Symmetry: D2
Subunit: 275 residues, 4 copies
Amino acid sequence: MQVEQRTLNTAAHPFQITAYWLDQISDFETAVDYPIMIICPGGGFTYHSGREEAPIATRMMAAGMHTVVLNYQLIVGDQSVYPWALQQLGATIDWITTQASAHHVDCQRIILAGFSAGGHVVATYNGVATQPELRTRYHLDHYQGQHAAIILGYPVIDLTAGFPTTSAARNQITTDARLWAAQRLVTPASKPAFVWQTATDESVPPINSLKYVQAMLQHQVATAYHLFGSGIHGLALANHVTQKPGKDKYLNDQAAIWPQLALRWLQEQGLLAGN
Amino acid sequence: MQVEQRTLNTAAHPFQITAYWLDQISDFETAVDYPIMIICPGGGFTYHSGREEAPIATRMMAAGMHTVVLNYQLIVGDQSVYPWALQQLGATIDWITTQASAHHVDCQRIILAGFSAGGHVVATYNGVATQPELRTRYHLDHYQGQHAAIILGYPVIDLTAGFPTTSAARNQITTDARLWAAQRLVTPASKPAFVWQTATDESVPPINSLKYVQAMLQHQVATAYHLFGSGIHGLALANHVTQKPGKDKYLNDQAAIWPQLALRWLQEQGLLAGN
Amino acid sequence: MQVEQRTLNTAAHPFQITAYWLDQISDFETAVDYPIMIICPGGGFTYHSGREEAPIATRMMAAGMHTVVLNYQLIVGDQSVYPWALQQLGATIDWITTQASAHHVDCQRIILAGFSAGGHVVATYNGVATQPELRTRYHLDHYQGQHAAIILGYPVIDLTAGFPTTSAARNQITTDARLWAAQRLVTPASKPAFVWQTATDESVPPINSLKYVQAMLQHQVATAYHLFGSGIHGLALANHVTQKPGKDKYLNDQAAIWPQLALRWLQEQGLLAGN
Amino acid sequence: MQVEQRTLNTAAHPFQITAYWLDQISDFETAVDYPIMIICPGGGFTYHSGREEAPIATRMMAAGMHTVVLNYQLIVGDQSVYPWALQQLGATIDWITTQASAHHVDCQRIILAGFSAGGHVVATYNGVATQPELRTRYHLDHYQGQHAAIILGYPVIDLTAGFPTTSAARNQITTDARLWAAQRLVTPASKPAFVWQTATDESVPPINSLKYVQAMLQHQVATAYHLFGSGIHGLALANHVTQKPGKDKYLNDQAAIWPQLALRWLQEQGLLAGN
């Protein structure tokens, strides 16, 4: 295993990634290409949450995949999140294709994962990047590679659906209303999505994920949806690993099965080797 | 364990039930009252599917509850399903209260489970029976007892949403359109619901379950929802037990976890003893 | 599902069984034959423990098999357990063969399950019934049918190994010392065994199960062995179902997985339909 | 996450380790000390198997622990494995104590894990390091820190029990017959052990792990033992991750649950945070 932290410069706003590369197993006689998961953590568009980075990356890596954590564009200085964050996702996927030979990456198995605010970036990208008119509009032309599926954990989906709490805050994320509601960008070309959230989510109302899932069904895109009946927002792994010290509310044994469900779903989609 | 099969006549249309009663464990120094689940199987309102009767009842009994299979009103012989089926559910719950001392039934833990067409009866009942005006409208007066929660497996929810396929068939089930869409009968008084379906369901579109769950959320009623990514309609246990001989399409190892999920959800609701 | 309770008289000491028969699923276009498990509960040879009867039978039935609870010979009324108990097992298997057509029993999939004291009867039977000389010695002549495998939960294996506590009690169970140590009756003809116990068992020392498994290995008989690290003797299902009211020591979530393990092992042996 | 590869020099034979350090989660308000697992892979004492290094480390790290892979002494040049490998384990634990403050390591939760040949090193260390006379004999005096438990996967336990196949090969490992049989070094001071193997193991007969478990029980040391009924030697994770390409025999879905069992066992032992 190797860790690589660097700046990628192939976007209008350069940005940092942290890649965790699997090394080839030495007593294997033939090389193996592995899937790769790009992770966009939460943080309300003002920070990148550590709880939704390495702990999640490490769990996915244990199942035999490379991971890359993307420091997508935040509200910082006078800058909004969009359109920049969408171009950075495209640039990261393109960079992966250039690294694929060196690190044994299966470019037909690039998965995107977004949590809370990072889920808006990923859910929006799923719609934008799979539609030529929108790729051009948001300057995604001339990037190589494409993702094969997305995973969304308690995602922000529609900026008018409860998160954020004010119009001023919404506008800071983007004044481009075409990007407020990711469910409205779904077409039959959108990639398959595994979506999970808790029904008791207060800060990002579960109507968010429900609306995205509804739009996916209505456009005949393969999707799985797990709305657990309890738990606060921001559970992450929902176990002791991502538990804020002394806070029981970050533990939910029902929701904690989601990585297993997600990995099995990836296997069903033929995007991860089965066993 | 005891099996009791009989006709109940305390409804305009008499009907058959099959009760599977738990016996007390003789080692125990004190008697214990157990929850009870009423099961309404599928069958498109033209029969009662055996795949969704004893196999499901037995799995639930293994977790320490009594079960009752309800042969609800069908359209055979040019009959309507409603309002008769609601009265029969009411009468089954009532009969259960009269059997509580004899069988150690905990009447604060009566659970309703509906599959496909049976899910329409249960979901509709969840709204109707919890609203005094509707109880009077549909003649549930003088029926004792109430259920505490429902479980719905690939349920028919809205008779205009894909099942059945024609206006004639919809109206045959009932010409009373206030009863067509169970999601519209949801109020804060509805009991909590565990709901599951497959996203690829081609007989009753998944929008059915999604709409019901949306309404539950919008009325602040506790709910959990598992929309598995793959699998045909009518999986039942989704394993070898309910598999039609030689038909692999009735097997889905991901969906097969639903009973464990439902049982753990019941425990969380305080409706089944915990571990 | 049907419950049948009756006395079998085809042994020197008549005895009671309780059979729980699966009914055919009417939806199925073809009939199917199911495996059947004979359960011998614990009770220290002075009673038959209900905690190890219906609760265990029901869990096994949920996986698609018939079950029979066997009230094997006890020492009450100054009786010995052997050789009578062996004949009663033989006679139960024989009776099962006569019921095969009536109940769709697959007689190539008869499984024996023994708990604690019941485990001694089953383990001993596994050696005795598979050896022509011992079948003649203990009068199993003219009994039809044979079992295909055994399951043992915290079994008494060797009457000199901690249970019972005195020579008098050991000899009361049987003055025939060739029957004291079931591990010594193991030959390559013994049927495959799934064995589990807790390492902290203080009533029947875990050396009991360990010795049996060692002998199975040494005679090239397929075996699996799960010695859980914690938990008292007599956990049964190790969950709320078999928990003595208010006694937390009967709960062990790690040991509670044993039925799933045993069922998956049966599938691997080709003795239960797979998924 | 940080990777550190270096030589440790505090032993007669210096040696390499590879440490995978968890970083502190940035949005946590208070620091958290994490357990650490030292892994000794297999390789028949002639190499260090890659299949039993990073893939296993990564799985344990996903559960919230640091890991260190130990390149213990191999048969190389004219050198035997012992006594050197035992001193290198002591030196690694001592080095961990010196790093504990910097990396937030809980020194009361140092776990040792050994696979096949590496299991002999760990099982022998468990006995040697917990007995003052033997610590002195094997030059382990004046090292700081101690392990709290061990995990053994299909371990070589007794060098006379089938692995290796010749006396010449055994002697190359060590001519010190006091160290041939790790079960004979067990005392009540040995640390708790989680042990797993397959019953069908051909290259390291399962009598190995059975003998170690038997000795632990007989000296009242807490132990758990899982002898799965099928699978070849060297399964590692027993899933697609450690599967040699195109070889189904490295897949065993039953044995693949061992990491989950091991982690839960560590939690029961109070050696890993619960959830």
